[PDB]
């Protein structure tokens, strides 16, 4: 039934001695991997606690060992067996008793479901509970389970360690695989939750492995095909058992896979040579996480020294001895004393945990006893009355060293901190085909990157980023898809990227560079005489300078002889100055100064043109008045119209400020690399047209009066010369107007109007001086 140990204070015990069998009987056959060893460990722990005078010197500690048979309902009934001893008041019945057996705490509930049941039934009675093998993450809410403690970390910490190894090594794609039950599902669920909370990691695959049959070998192919769909995902995490991964490796080998994606192992994988077989090539480079293992020396000596007649408290020892050696009292066994020799047994890794659990219970009870009473040698009566939340609070705050090197403690939630060491498999170049230690995980991840290479490769050989990092000078973040990985699209070349996150439009009037760092147009467009067509007008202007160097040559000496006196002296001075004025105007407009000094230039062509025709205007009237029937009079009338032209530009300056702007924008998308810029002062088509139109108005009223001049027998050579010039002048004016219309649609017209205007002035002036200087050469040769 149950082992009973005498003592003034006792604590209960739950262990899975037997295993469930058919549907009828609750439990059938016994199990040796976890059945008897844990009981013997607890018995040894109690014995050496009672022997040690350091802890509980004057007071002893008892216990009540008991089995659970791995059944939820059976566990509930047995747990009720602990508490009924104190709850029962009395029984009104007689047949024709026993000590109260006051329990203080309970140690057991190895599984998961039996743990939840015992916690739920002992939360109501307020009794502390410490488990040693319960790894389910559900038993982690303090509010849901008040009186509950664990000395073994849950799977949440394992998930945290894995996501830390993935993050540190550098990866983005991870595939989750799990087996049936309540272990694989919860492990991957915790893994996804941590990844989403921490950020920077995502899940791309999610497959589930049922267990409806064992002779299929088809669903494995389906999942390996599902995983092979994306060649980029080269890292997977597994939560399944050894058989599942063994089949997965076998399928990968028979499928002749070349990518050889990496594996990340879970506690089920660990460090065991059995699973790996003929798959050493494909399993290489697997990162596995395994709990630390420690071997004690006292328990092994204790268990190896016990025999049938030595101890009688244990009720299952005889049945274990029968089942271990397979002999019943058709083979009989008497006094073998070879338990540690015939069977090559090895102690399990949970022995240290039950020993530590008993230690934590004893230490908390000792501290509570010291604080409750210190003036009493033995057991003070106050201790029996005091119990409940006080003992739980003392259990939470404890810190000491147990059998293993590592200490034991409890955090806020109530579970022990996770401590693991990372292993890896290397065979192609390692001296030892076995696993080698590469790092540890206690509170912060500590891993040696350069220590792991698995041969013919650098430690960061695999890459799983879901996108090649685009940094060629163009970048942009797209919200489409999961935030995990980003896709970049080439945005226009007419602006640069802003904050490496978007393609904003850069300010105008300046082109962008090539690497998308700045938006500036260094090159500019300036007019040149040699390169553009402006050389020919420049040459024409130079040719005109030679002509005026000869007309004025025979003027300095020929000023008093009675030969030139036929022509008016006052008129001769007007034409001399008018010819020189237009020569300087063509030279000024050819030049393009950057500064706002064009004001002195606009008057050269605006006001300088009137004084050129002024002499011609009064000359026709003077020779016409003698035909119809005071030299200073003709001088005054021409001087007046000069004031009109001179005052015409003065009022223009008062109308609007003469602001000069050199900035210009091409605004052409055909060639983003091209940047056309033009600088001009007061560039208006109407301004140049109306200024030039003044001379045309006065020329019309003069030509009409010149029709009757033809045929007068006064000066045959002079009359015939003037008539020829008139037709030429109107020709160039009439062709000027059609030019600007229907041509300014392009962007290169800023420098073509200047050139054609330059030759127009030279041509109109050359014909004027040609006929004027014709009579001058007569007195030279003749």
Residue closer to its own copies, measured from CB, 117 or 391: 117
Q: Is 133 a known ligand-binding residue? A: yes
* Start-to-end C-alpha separation, the chain: 161
172: Cβ–Cβ under 8 A, 6 or more apart, which residues? Answer: 201, 202, 464, 465, 466, 484, 485
Among candidates 70, 54, 164, 162, which has minimal Cα distance to 108?
70
DSSP 18: B
Q: How many whole angstroms separate alpha carbon 353 and alpha carbon 34?
A: 13
For residues 125 and 321, which CB has a smaller minimum distance to its own copies in the complex?
125
Min separation Cβ 322 and its own copies, Å = 23
Among 1, 331, 341, 412, binds its own copies (CB under 8 A): 1
Does residue 694 bind its own copies (CB under 8 A)? no
Which residue number, 121 or 771, has a Cβ lying nearer to its own copies? 121
Shortest gap between Cβ of 4 and its own copies (angstroms)?
9
Q: How far is the CB of 73 from its own copies (least distance, A)?
A: 8
Q: State the minimum distance, in angstroms, from the CB of residue 92 to its own copies.
A: 7
- Name the 3-class secondary structure at 489: coil
CA-nearest of 448, 413, 435 to 157 is 413
CA–CA dist 174, 170 (Å, integer) = 11
Indicate whether 741 belongs to the interface with its own copies (CB under 8 A): no
Q: How far is the CB of 93 from its own copies (least distance, A)?
A: 4
CB of 117 to its own copies, least distance (A): 7
Chain-centroid distance, C-alpha 221: 35
x/- string (CB under 8 A) for its own copies, residues 86-105?
-xxxxxxxxxxxx-------
CB of 48 to its own copies, least distance (A): 28
The answer to the question of residue 471 lying near its own copies (CB under 8 A) is no
Question: Which range of residues in 81-89, 191-199, 656-664, 707-715 is near its own copies by CB under 8 A?
Answer: 81-89
What whole-number distance in Å separates Cα of residue 136 and Cα of residue 153?
9
Of positions 58, 84, 305, 401, contacts its own copies by CB under 8 A: 84
Q: Is 267 annotated among the ligand-binding residues?
A: yes
The answer to whether the annotation marks 494 as part of a ligand binding site is no
Rule CB under 8 A: say whether 77 interacts with its own copies.
Answer: yes
Which of 86, 553 has the CB closer to its own copies? 86
Q: Which of 83, 581, 702, 752 binds its own copies (CB under 8 A)?
A: 83
What span, in angstroms and rounded, lies between the C-alpha atoms of 204 and 162? Answer: 17
Minimal distance, residue 113 CB to its own copies, in Å: 12
Picking from 554, 486, 505, 540, the residue whose alpha carbon sits closest to that of residue 759 is 540
Query: 752-772 vs 535-551: helix axis angle to the nearest 10?
Result: 20
135 labelled ligand-binding? yes
User: Helix 599-628 vs helix 685-705: angle between axes, to the nearest 10 degrees?
Assistant: 10
355 by Cβ neighbours in 10 Å (0-12 / 13-18 / 19+) ranks as: buried
Count of residues interacting with its own copies (CB under 8 A): 24
509 known ligand binder: no
CB contact set of 752 (below 8 Å; sequence gap of 6+):
none
Q: Which stretch binds its own copies (CB under 8 A): 54-62, 75-83, 356-364, 527-535?
A: 75-83
Handedness of CA 709, 713, 719, 723 (dihedral sign): positive
Q: Which C-beta is closer to its own copies: that of 89 or that of 331?
A: 89
Between 388 and 433, CB nearer to its own copies: 388
In the stretch 103-142, what mask flags binding to its own copies with x, by CB under 8 A? --------------x--xx--xx-----------------
Give me the sign of the Cα torsion angle 233, 237, 240, 241.
Answer: positive
Nearest distance from C-beta of residue 547 to its own copies, angstroms: 39
Question: To the nearest whole angstrom, how small is the minimum distance from the Cβ of residue 124 to its own copies?
Answer: 6
Give the DSSP letter string of 410-422: --SSSBPPP-EEE
Q: Which of residues 120 and 336 has its CB atom nearest to its own copies in the complex?
A: 120
For its own copies, the closer of residues 87 and 670 by Cβ is 87
DSSP string, 161-175: HHHHHHHHH---EEE
Query: Which range of residues in 84-92, 136-144, 362-370, 546-554 is near its own copies by CB under 8 A?
Result: 84-92
Does residue 88 contact residue 125 with C-beta atoms inside 8 Å? no
3-state secondary structure of 130: strand
Exactly one of 21, 33, 52, 80 binds its own copies (CB under 8 A); which one?
80
| Contact between 624 and its own copies per CB under 8 A | no
Q: How far is the CB of 1 from its own copies (least distance, A)?
A: 7
Contact 232, 167 (CB under 8 A): no
Inter-residue contact 620 to 702 (CB < 8 Å):
yes
Q: Give the range of 85-93, 647-655, 728-736, 741-749 binding its own copies by CB under 8 A.
A: 85-93
Q: Which CB, 76 or 603, lies closer to its own copies?
A: 76
Does residue 81 bind its own copies (CB under 8 A)?
A: yes
Helix, strand, or coil (residue 445): strand
Tell me which long-range contacts 744-749 makes (C-beta under 8 A, separation of at least 24): 744/685, 747/666, 747/668, 747/676, 747/678, 748/676
| Least Cβ distance, residue 388 to its own copies (angstroms) | 11
**Selected range binding its own copies among 79-87, 148-156, 373-381, 504-512, rule: CB under 8 A:** 79-87
Ligand-binding annotation for 350, yes or no, is yes
* Residue 727 parent element (H or E): helix 716-740
546 binds its own copies (CB under 8 A): no
User: Binding site: residue ranges?
Assistant: 112, 133-135, 183, 267, 350
* Binding-site ranges for its own copies (CB under 8 A): 1, 76-77, 80-81, 83-84, 87-98, 117, 120-121, 124-125
User: Binding site for L-glutamate: residue ranges?
Assistant: 112, 133-135, 183, 267, 350
């Amino acid at each position: 039934h149950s082992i009973r140990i005498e003592g003034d204070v006792t604590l209960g015990g739950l262990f899975p001695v037997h295993a469930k069998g058919p549907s009828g009987v609750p439990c059938g056959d016994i199990k040796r991997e976890n059945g008897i060893h844990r009981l013997e460990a607890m018995l040894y722990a109690l014995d050496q606690i009672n022997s040690d005078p350091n802890l509980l010197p004057n007071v002893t500690l008892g216990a009540r060992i008991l089995d659970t048979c791995s059944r939820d309902t059976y566990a509930l009934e047995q747990s009720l067996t602990f508490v009924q001893a104190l709850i029962q008041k009395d029984t009104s019945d007689v047949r024709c008793f026993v000590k109260p057996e006051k329990v203080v705490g309970v140690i057991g509930a190895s599984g998961s479901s039996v743990s939840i049941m015992v916690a739920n039934i002992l939360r109501l009675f307020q009794i502390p509970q410490i488990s040693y093998a319960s790894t389910a993450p559900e038993l982690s809410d303090d509010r849901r389970y008040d009186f509950f403690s664990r000395v073994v970390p849950p799977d949440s910490f394992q998930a945290q360690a894995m996501v830390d190894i993935v993050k540190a090594l550098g990866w983005n794609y991870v595939s989750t695989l799990a087996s049936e039950g309540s272990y694989g599902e919860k492990g991957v669920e915790s893994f996804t939750q941590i990844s989403k909370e921490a950020g920077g990691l995502c899940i791309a695959q999610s497959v589930r492995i049922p267990q409806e049959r064992k002779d299929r070998t088809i669903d494995f192919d389906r999942i390996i095909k599902q995983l092979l769909d994306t060649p980029n995902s080269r890292a997977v995490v597994i939560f399944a058992n050894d058989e599942d991964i063994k089949q997965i490796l076998a399928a990968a080998k028979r499928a002749d896979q070349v990518g050889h994606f990496l594996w990340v192992g879970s506690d089920s994988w660990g460090s065991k040579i059995n699973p790996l077989h003929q798959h050493e090539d494909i399993a290489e480079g697997a990162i596995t996480i395994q709990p630390k293992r420690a071997t004690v020396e006292g328990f092994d000596a204790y268990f190896t020294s016990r025999t049938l007649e030595n101890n009688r408290r244990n009720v299952w020892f005889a049945e274990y001895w029968e089942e271990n050696f397979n002999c019943k009292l058709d083979r009989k066994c008497t006094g073998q004393e070879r338990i540690g020799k015939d069977s090559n047994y090895e102690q399990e890794g949970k022995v240290q945990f039950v020993i530590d659990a008993v230690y934590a219970m004893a230490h908390a009870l000792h501290h509570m006893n010291k604080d409750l009473c210190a003036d009493y040698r033995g057991v003070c009566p106050e201790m029996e009355q005091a119990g409940g939340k006080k003992l739980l609070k003392y259990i939470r705050n404890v810190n000491f060293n147990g059998s293993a090197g590592t200490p034991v403690m409890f955090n806020k939630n109530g579970d022990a901190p996770g401590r693991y060491d990372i292993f890896q498999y290397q065979t192609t170049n390692t001296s030892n085909p076995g696993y080698r230690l590469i790092g540890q995980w206690t509170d912060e991840l500590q891993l040696n990157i350069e220590d792991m290479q698995w041969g013919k490769g650098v430690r960061e050989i695999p890459a799983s980023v879901c996108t090649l990092p685009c940094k060629p000078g163009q970048r942009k973040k797209t919200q489409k898809g999961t935030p995990c990985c980003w896709t970049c699209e080439p945005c226009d070349g007419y602006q640069y990227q802003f904050d490496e996150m978007t393609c904003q439009h850069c300010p105008y009037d300046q082109r962008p560079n090539e690497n998308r760092t700045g938006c500036q147009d260094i090159p500019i467009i300036k007019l040149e005489w040699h390169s553009p067509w402006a050389v020919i007008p420049v040459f024409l202007a130079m040719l005109g300078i030679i002509a005026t160097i000869f007309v004025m040559a025979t003027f300095i000496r020929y000023n008093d002889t009675p030969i030139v006196r036929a022509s008016g002296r006052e008129l001769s001075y007007v034409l001399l100055t008018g010819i020189f004025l237009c020569y300087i105007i063509t030279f000024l407009m050819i030049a393009k100064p950057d500064v706002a000094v064009c004001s002195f230039r606009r008057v050269f062509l605006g006001l300088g043109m009137c004084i050129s025709y002024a002499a011609l205007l009064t000359k026709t009237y003077r020779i016409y008045r003698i035909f119809e029937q005071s030299p200073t009079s003709q001088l005054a009338i021409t001087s007046s119209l000069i004031s009109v032209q001179l005052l015409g530009v003065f009022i223009w300056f008062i109308v609007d400020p003469p602001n000069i702007i050199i900035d210009y924008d091409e605004h052409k998308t055909m060639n983003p690399e091209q940047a056309r810029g033009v600088l001009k002062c007061d560039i208006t088509d109407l301004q140049i047209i109306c200024s030039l139109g003044y001379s045309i108005l006065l020329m019309v009223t003069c030509t009409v009066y010149a029709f009757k001049t033809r045929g007068v027998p006064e000066n045959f050579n002079e009359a015939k010369y003037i008539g020829f010039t008139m037709y030429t002048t109107c020709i160039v004016w009439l062709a000027f107007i059609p030019i600007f219309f229907g041509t300014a649609q392009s962007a290169e017209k800023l420098y073509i109007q200047t050139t054609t205007l330059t030759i127009s002035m030279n041509l109109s002036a050359s014909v004027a001086l040609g006929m004027l200087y014709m009579p001058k050469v007569y007195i030279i040769i003749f």
